[PDB]
Amino acid sequence: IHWPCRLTIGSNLSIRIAAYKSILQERVKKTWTVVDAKTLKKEDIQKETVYCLETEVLKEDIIQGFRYGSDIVPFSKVDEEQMKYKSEGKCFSVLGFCKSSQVQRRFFMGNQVLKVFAARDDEAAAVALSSLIHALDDLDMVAIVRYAYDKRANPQVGVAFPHIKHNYECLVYVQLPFMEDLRQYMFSSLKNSKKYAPTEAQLNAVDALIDSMSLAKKDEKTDTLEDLFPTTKIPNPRFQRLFQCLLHRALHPREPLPPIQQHIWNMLNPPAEVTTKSQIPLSKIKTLFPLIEAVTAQEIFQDNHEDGPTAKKLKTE
Amino acid sequence: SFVRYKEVYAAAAEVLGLILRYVMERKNILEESLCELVAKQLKQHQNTMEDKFIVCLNKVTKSFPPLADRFMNAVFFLLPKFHGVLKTLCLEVVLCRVEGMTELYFQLKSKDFVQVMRHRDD
Amino acid sequence: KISNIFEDVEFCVMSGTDSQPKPDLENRIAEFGGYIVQNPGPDTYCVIAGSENIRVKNIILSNKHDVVKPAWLLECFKTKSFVPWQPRFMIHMCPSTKEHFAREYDC
Amino acid sequence: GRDSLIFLVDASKAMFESQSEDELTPFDMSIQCIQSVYISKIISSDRDLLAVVFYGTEKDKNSVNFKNIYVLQELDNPGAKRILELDQFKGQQGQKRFQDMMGHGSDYSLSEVLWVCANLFSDVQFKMSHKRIMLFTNEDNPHGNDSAKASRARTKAGDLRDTGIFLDLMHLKKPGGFDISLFYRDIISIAEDEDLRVHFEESSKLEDLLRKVRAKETRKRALSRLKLKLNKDIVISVGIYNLVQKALKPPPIKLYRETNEPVKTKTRTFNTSTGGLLLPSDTKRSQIYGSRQIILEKEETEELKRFDDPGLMLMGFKPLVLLKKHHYLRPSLFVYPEESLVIGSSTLFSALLIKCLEKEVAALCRYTPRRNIPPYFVALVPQEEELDDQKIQVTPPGFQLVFLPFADDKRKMPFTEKIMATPEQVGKMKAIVEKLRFTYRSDSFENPVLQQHFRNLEALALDLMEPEQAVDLTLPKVEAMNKRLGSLVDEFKELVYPPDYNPEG
Amino acid sequence: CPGESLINPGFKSKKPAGGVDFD
Amino acid sequence: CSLLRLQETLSAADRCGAALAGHQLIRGLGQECVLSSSPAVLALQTSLVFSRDFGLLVFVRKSLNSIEFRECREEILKFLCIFLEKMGQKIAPYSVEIKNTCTSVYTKDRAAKCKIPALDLLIKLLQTFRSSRLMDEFKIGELFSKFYGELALKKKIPDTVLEKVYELLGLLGEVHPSEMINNAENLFRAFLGELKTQMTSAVREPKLPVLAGCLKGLSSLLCNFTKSMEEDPQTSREIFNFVLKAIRYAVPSAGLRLFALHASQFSTCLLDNYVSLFEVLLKWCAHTNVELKKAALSALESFLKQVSNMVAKNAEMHKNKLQYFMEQFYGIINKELSIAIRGYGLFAGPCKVINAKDVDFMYVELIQRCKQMFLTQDRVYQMPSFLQSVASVLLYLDTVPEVYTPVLEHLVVMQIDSFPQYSPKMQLVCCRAIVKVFLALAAKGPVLRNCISTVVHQG
DNA sequence: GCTAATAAACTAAAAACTATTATTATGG
DNA sequence: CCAAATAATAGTTTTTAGTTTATTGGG
Numbered sequence A: 001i002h003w004p005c006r007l008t009i010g011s012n013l014s015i016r017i018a019a020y021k022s023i024l025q026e027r028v029k030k031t032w033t034v035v036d037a038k039t040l041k042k043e044d045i046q047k048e049t050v051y052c053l054e055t056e057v058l059k060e061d062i063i064q065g066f067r068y069g070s071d072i073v074p075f076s077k078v079d080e081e082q083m084k085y086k087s088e089g090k091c092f093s094v095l096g097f098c099k100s101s102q103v104q105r106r107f108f109m110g111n112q113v114l115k116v117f118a119a120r121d122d123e124a125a126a127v128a129l130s131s132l133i134h135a136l137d138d139l140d141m142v143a144i145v146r147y148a149y150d151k152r153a154n155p156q157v158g159v160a161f162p163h164i165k166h167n168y169e170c171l172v173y174v175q176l177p178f179m180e181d182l183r184q185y186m187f188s189s190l191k192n193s194k195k196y197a198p199t200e201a202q203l204n205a206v207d208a209l210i211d212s213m214s215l216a217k218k219d220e221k222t223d224t225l226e227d228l229f230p231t232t233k234i235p236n237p238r239f240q241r242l243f244q245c246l247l248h249r250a251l252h253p254r255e256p257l258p259p260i261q262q263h264i265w266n267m268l269n270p271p272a273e274v275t276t277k278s279q280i281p282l283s284k285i286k287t288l289f290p291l292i293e294a295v296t297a298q299e300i301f302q303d304n305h306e307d308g309p310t311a312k313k314l315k316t317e
Numbered sequence B: 001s002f003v004r005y006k007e008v009y010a011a012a013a014e015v016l017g018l019i020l021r022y023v024m025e026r027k028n029i030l031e032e033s034l035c036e037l038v039a040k041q042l043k044q045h046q047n048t049m050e051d052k053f054i055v056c057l058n059k060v061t062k063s064f065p066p067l068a069d070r071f072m073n074a075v076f077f078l079l080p081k082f083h084g085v086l087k088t089l090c091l092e093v094v095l096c097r098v099e100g101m102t103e104l105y106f107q108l109k110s111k112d113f114v115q116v117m118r119h120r121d122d
Numbered sequence C: 001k002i003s004n005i006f007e008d009v010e011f012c013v014m015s016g017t018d019s020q021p022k023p024d025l026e027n028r029i030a031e032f033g034g035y036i037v038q039n040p041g042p043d044t045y046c047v048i049a050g051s052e053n054i055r056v057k058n059i060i061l062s063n064k065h066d067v068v069k070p071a072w073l074l075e076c077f078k079t080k081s082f083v084p085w086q087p088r089f090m091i092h093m094c095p096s097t098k099e100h101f102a103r104e105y106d107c
Numbered sequence D: 001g002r003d004s005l006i007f008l009v010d011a012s013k014a015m016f017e018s019q020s021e022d023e024l025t026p027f028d029m030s031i032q033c034i035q036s037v038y039i040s041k042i043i044s045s046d047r048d049l050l051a052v053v054f055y056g057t058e059k060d061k062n063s064v065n066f067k068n069i070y071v072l073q074e075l076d077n078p079g080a081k082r083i084l085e086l087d088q089f090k091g092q093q094g095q096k097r098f099q100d101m102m103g104h105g106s107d108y109s110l111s112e113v114l115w116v117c118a119n120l121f122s123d124v125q126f127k128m129s130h131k132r133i134m135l136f137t138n139e140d141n142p143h144g145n146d147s148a149k150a151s152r153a154r155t156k157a158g159d160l161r162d163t164g165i166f167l168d169l170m171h172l173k174k175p176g177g178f179d180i181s182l183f184y185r186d187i188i189s190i191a192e193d194e195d196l197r198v199h200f201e202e203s204s205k206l207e208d209l210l211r212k213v214r215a216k217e218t219r220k221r222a223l224s225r226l227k228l229k230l231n232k233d234i235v236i237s238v239g240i241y242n243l244v245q246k247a248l249k250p251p252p253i254k255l256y257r258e259t260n261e262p263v264k265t266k267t268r269t270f271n272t273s274t275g276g277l278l279l280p281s282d283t284k285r286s287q288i289y290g291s292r293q294i295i296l297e298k299e300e301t302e303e304l305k306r307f308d309d310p311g312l313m314l315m316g317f318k319p320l321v322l323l324k325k326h327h328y329l330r331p332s333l334f335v336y337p338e339e340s341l342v343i344g345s346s347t348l349f350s351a352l353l354i355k356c357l358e359k360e361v362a363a364l365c366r367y368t369p370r371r372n373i374p375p376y377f378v379a380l381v382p383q384e385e386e387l388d389d390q391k392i393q394v395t396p397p398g399f400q401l402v403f404l405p406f407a408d409d410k411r412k413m414p415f416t417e418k419i420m421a422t423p424e425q426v427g428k429m430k431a432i433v434e435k436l437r438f439t440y441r442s443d444s445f446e447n448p449v450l451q452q453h454f455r456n457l458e459a460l461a462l463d464l465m466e467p468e469q470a471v472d473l474t475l476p477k478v479e480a481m482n483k484r485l486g487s488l489v490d491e492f493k494e495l496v497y498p499p500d501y502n503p504e505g
Numbered sequence E: 001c002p003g004e005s006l007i008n009p010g011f012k013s014k015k016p017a018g019g020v021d022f023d
Numbered sequence F: 001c002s003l004l005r006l007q008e009t010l011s012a013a014d015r016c017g018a019a020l021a022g023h024q025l026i027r028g029l030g031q032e033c034v035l036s037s038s039p040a041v042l043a044l045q046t047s048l049v050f051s052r053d054f055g056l057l058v059f060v061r062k063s064l065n066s067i068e069f070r071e072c073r074e075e076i077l078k079f080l081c082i083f084l085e086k087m088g089q090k091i092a093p094y095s096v097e098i099k100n101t102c103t104s105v106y107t108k109d110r111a112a113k114c115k116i117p118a119l120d121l122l123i124k125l126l127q128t129f130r131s132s133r134l135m136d137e138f139k140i141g142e143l144f145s146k147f148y149g150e151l152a153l154k155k156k157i158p159d160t161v162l163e164k165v166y167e168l169l170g171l172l173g174e175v176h177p178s179e180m181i182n183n184a185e186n187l188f189r190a191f192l193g194e195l196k197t198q199m200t201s202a203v204r205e206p207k208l209p210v211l212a213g214c215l216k217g218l219s220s221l222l223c224n225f226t227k228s229m230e231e232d233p234q235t236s237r238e239i240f241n242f243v244l245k246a247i248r249y250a251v252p253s254a255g256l257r258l259f260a261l262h263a264s265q266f267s268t269c270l271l272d273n274y275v276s277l278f279e280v281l282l283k284w285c286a287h288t289n290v291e292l293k294k295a296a297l298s299a300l301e302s303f304l305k306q307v308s309n310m311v312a313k314n315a316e317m318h319k320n321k322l323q324y325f326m327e328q329f330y331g332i333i334n335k336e337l338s339i340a341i342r343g344y345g346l347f348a349g350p351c352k353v354i355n356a357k358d359v360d361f362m363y364v365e366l367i368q369r370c371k372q373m374f375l376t377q378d379r380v381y382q383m384p385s386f387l388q389s390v391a392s393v394l395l396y397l398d399t400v401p402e403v404y405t406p407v408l409e410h411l412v413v414m415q416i417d418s419f420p421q422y423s424p425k426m427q428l429v430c431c432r433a434i435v436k437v438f439l440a441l442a443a444k445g446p447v448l449r450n451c452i453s454t455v456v457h458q459g
Numbered sequence G: 001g002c003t004a005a006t007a008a009a010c011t012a013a014a015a016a017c018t019a020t021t022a023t024t025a026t027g028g
Numbered sequence H: 001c002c003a004a005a006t007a008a009t010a011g012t013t014t015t016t017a018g019t020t021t022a023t024t025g026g027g
Helices: A077-082 A123-139 A200-213 A237-251 A262-268 A272-288 B007-021 B032-043 B051-063 B068-081 B085-096 B105-110 B113-118 C022-030 C054-061 C070-078 C095-104 D026-044 D080-087 D094-101 D110-122 D141-145 D147-162 D206-210 D299-303 D345-359 D423-435 D448-462 D478-485 D488-496 F002-012 F020-036 F043-060 F067-084 F089-109 F116-131 F140-151 F164-169 F178-199 F208-225 F232-245 F251-261 F274-284 F290-312 F318-332 F335-353 F356-375 F383-396 F402-417 F424-441 F445-458
Strands: A003-009 A013-024 A045-052 A062-068 A071-074 A092-099 A109-118 A141-147 A156-164 A169-175 C010-013 C046-048 D002-010 D049-055 D069-076 D128-136 D165-169 D224-229 D235-241 D253-256 D264-271 D283-289 D292-296 D311-319 D333-338 D361-368 D376-383 D393-395 D398-404
Touching: A003 A092, A013 A123, A013 A169, A013 D488, A062 A077, A062 D448, A071 D253, A071 D448, A077 C054, A092 A156, A109 A123, A109 A156, A123 A141, A123 A156, A123 A169, A123 D423, A123 D488, A141 A169, A200 A272, A200 D311, A200 D345, A237 A262, A237 D283, A237 D292, B007 B032, B007 B051, B032 B051, B032 B068, B051 B068, B051 B085, B068 B085, B068 D110, B068 D147, B105 B113, B105 D110, B113 F020, C010 C022, C022 C070, C054 D448, D002 D026, D002 D110, D026 D049, D026 D080, D026 D094, D026 D128, D026 D206, D049 D080, D049 D110, D069 D080, D069 D110, D080 D448, D110 D128, D110 D147, D141 D147, D147 D165, D235 D345, D311 D376, D333 D345, D345 D361, D345 D376, D345 D398, D361 D398, D423 D478, D423 D488, D478 D488, F002 F020, F002 F043, F020 F043, F020 F067, F043 F067, F043 F089, F067 F089, F067 F116, F089 F116, F116 F164, F140 F164, F140 F178, F164 F208, F178 F208, F178 F232, F208 F232, F208 F251, F232 F251, F232 F274, F251 F274, F251 F290, F274 F290, F274 F318, F290 F318, F290 F335, F318 F335, F335 F356, F335 F383, F356 F383, F356 F402, F383 F402, F383 F424, F402 F424, F402 F445, F424 F445
Parallel strands: C010 C046, D002 D049, D002 D128, D128 D165, D224 D311
Antiparallel strands: A003 A013, A013 A109, A045 D264, A062 A071, A062 D253, A092 A141, A109 A169, A141 A156, A156 A169, D049 D069, D224 D235, D235 D333, D283 D292, D311 D361, D333 D398, D361 D376, D376 D398
């Protein structure tokens, strides 16, 4: 769904913009409609939340509360609303420009990516947007931008960088983390690796493997790298397996579900030529590196097929 | 340090305390090097986990009392931190210190010696 | 209890300690059988507040209760009975108490 | 485990005394610092224990019965009631109330107070990562004079250091300097040189001590002890962590509308057709497509979601250039070598990290976080260690795991095609961007919602008439941007936008 | 210790919340 | 004496917070426990009245989840369980109300606690049940219903350790009245679902540890009055028990116990798969944890009895009797031998159906054998098995060889003489064998009288 | 004279970090 | 048929992934 807005730069610059969800962790919009195990009537099935201590309590006898460290604070949602900080509806403003190398994918917040144009069929907005795109591209600057989806959506801090395409030009928005959203965890210096310094021959075998396990190719001698295994134009097979099972059960309401299909592995399997190349350095490094390791496969009673008594054609006493 | 189960450090600390008590059978004192070795090994990696600390400490103290003086503060501090035989081991170690009762009553009352004393464990 | 008129009356004493310690207020009004509720419900007869906080002000925002001074409660205690409302103790009041004042009290 | 900190407060005379008798006294400023520490611990980690004790007063409260040394609160999680009773003696009139219900005039004993706090630490029933002591005083010579008690306290402090007690002292307001290296600097738990002079300073770190930082600071925990499998058997242990993690508002608590005590709930399934109780095994899931209600159980439903066992399945090596930075699925994680199951894992990790940094190719792998989860495609980029001027690790060595979106991770997109712009307007935009050029810093921002939430909760805890107001770090400096820029906005607006047209819906 | 938060030992020093300022 | 003052102090030692108070409470509690556990006959009544006062206090006064009371209440429940053991069935006065308390304790006083106390309450209740039978058992249906609603809670917050509820829900306390009799079908539905979840799974959810044992215990406690041999649910549970034995620590021993109790309930569906059952029980009654050995032994003898019955009442009787019995028992040549002898004795049944001469044939060869084990100078650990088997075959026999009569009765009397030097368990075994041979002898009136007179005289 | 959906805090387990527990093998 | 010395499983409170909501614009 299109999100109209205005790219506000200060109080004097406004650009009508067209925002769109480009990348997202897609999920099916049909949850499992749990029904009866007897008559398959979800209507006859219903949950019953109850409050008590017995000493039963009602929904109309409780409020919202919170834990204040070693303490408990009763704080109703009404009070929460009244003292809530509230953002502005659909407001989206820029905060400034910074170097692209100041931000890395490690700071990429959110689970979605927003490809944003200027507002559809606003030529002035589009030309202004493209001028910003070219200027930022040449300056290698990225625009820190404050974003609010609507009145009731919390404000977010993210950055927009221009995606360069000959058919279209967009600013790609990815949310950025607050200092609240960070983990400061130390890790040992793998550079000062005295007890884990690999032998040179091991390093050479590793490089040989990577050469033999590289998933790209040199195309046309133009040095345009040719990937052999995209996974970006390849759909997630989970829904394919789901549909396999659904179809089987619909056709076979009693048969057990079929296993995963081989082509599903193949679309998950990288090119086997790369595997054949890697086969030898795999064994080389396996020999080269000493690695030593420091419950529910619940089968039937019988690891065998059948048993039981049978003594036909035998009455010799 | 080798703790796969008790026997290793238990018996070995026992014989160490024997040797310490029997520094050429206790007539000249120049193995304070070994006393410092064991003092570190106690403080090292067992001012942290402190479980086997008291174990070997009691072992050597039985086999050599005049060493826990380096750890009188330590044992006192760790007193109100267990609930089982470990407490009994600490009590035994304290018992081995007679030069150690210069002032202890405040330590006992502060550590509520009267309380654990009240519970009957023969 | 002692002043059973305080019973069937739901007093919501969260505030007033500078005037008189709120525990003392609760004890005295329970000795009259007051219905001390720790959170103001629809049946809360009156809000008892003498130490105005963010919570008391928030209650004032919701024009649904009477923000009674604890001095009014001491008045009811010494009278051994629920005094009728007075336009000098309820900092904020429900529209019913507003009509009560405007019908029997001058501005 | 947790951590222990005790605030030891002098009471003899200097705390109430002020340098000018019109500003904060070494007494009340200690009150403020401890209140700030309480707030910071409540926000960050209440599981730590905090204790406050007074010495040099005319009475005492320690169980050990040591005179002049009054204990206020035990080593315990920061409770708001502690803060309230503390603020009861806050300010120049709060210490008036202190001198009303309490007082001073009797010499203390540092040996005795160290004894008391050692007992207090002995009272801890939890793993204390550190044993820190906070001292609030400005003089040392009261014990620096009598060498008996001086050496006694030195011996006791040495013992505490043997116990691992992280003793600390605070440069405190005194009209005669902090006066150390006289009885201190030879007795404190110190291992670094900061200042040993007689500095007439009144604070060394009260500034950030009073600084109210509101964040969680989760302890380091391995997000997953994963096992990277190269082909089928060359498997190594790897520690997966989330160096970036979205913070969330603390869960709401169900509690009365009448007494506000916590209320547990219970949800049950009842036969809507009968009212009879329904078993978990008494129902089945379904999805209706067309005329067919496909009915299924649960275990099969999760198994059809499980394709691989938990771990990482190496799919190969792909050049870093083949990775679309505009393509992003969900926040990336960090992968460190782990050598606790597969010995030699860290050596191989070092080898592969070096080789990947050289060749500049990421490791594409099939990822199964845990069971009953469809594996994803993830790129492991070799991210090297980086250290600051202090050589403190600012970037860890290892790899960065970035999700690689599938074909079905996008949405349909109706739009217009590419539209050019004049190079003059591009140059104007370059000038304007350079005008408002600001340095990015990852910690320059906080959630205003969360900040205001913390302030509201605090005000509720302290029953303030009003809450603190959250400053916003996300505001664009519109007046400042216009001031810095000038009429360049008007120039470019006339350049692109015709004067008749106003950008509007 | 350098680069360590006073309030939380073992935790890195907490820099101020800061803000945006053009250069 | 000391109990009064200590319980008074404990009633006074819980007048504040200060979890150290709870620590001293549990110290004095353990002391009172170790004191009252000591035997007495007059201090016992003081223990009873103090049980009254103290149980009341710790029921009402705790009212909390604070561990300063949780440790104390946990030790309280342990002490009350060891006190229920047999510190006087005259506890029955208390038995009712404390029941209520602990039930309420499990829910209200223990409302946020998920630890040992629930387990202690459950085991106390179960001991109360299986100790007190049909004198005050009038309060179960309400509790049965409440726990029935409780178990179907949509949260797994009842841990495996809490699945003792099933053993609790295993109920035959008074008559197993009609209400839970009706609910038993839905009970079975729940058990089938739970055990299918346990035992047919690939979702990293075995949860078998306690859940398996508690389900088996419940089923045992209930199948005493249900599950006739015409249900596919019956054979499904049978298959579940099968898979229990080897899907690849003593849960399978509980499985063997459960089967042994209701081997008959699974008849007509256990004829098949005989050899696997035989071999698996054989190997099971060979391993450590002699509880496992005895469980397998009892299960095997019950299974053998049942299969003997069915094959005796079969026209297709040939299969089981010829394929396994004589072959395996001969291949046998410690308790292994007694098992083989018992197998001979039970196999004697169908010999009357087919080849009635082989009845007396095996009888005679058994006489020869026991004679050969009679004269050699241990040698007595297997005498009762011989007696049992020969009594069985004699019961099947109708035209006995009276030549072996003096020999057999002399063997019986010498065994009776060798009754000493006997471990009590097999003393009971041998007395059972003697009464069984007497019952078998009872079929032959005049021979009965003469032989019994002679043997009693000689003994 | 208009139900094309999305910004959803919920009652989510589908880690357990570290703490007693218990059979086992027992020992003489 | 009780006869003691030794590892496992699972009592915590932790994150994270299926969840459910009020604003969307179609006779």
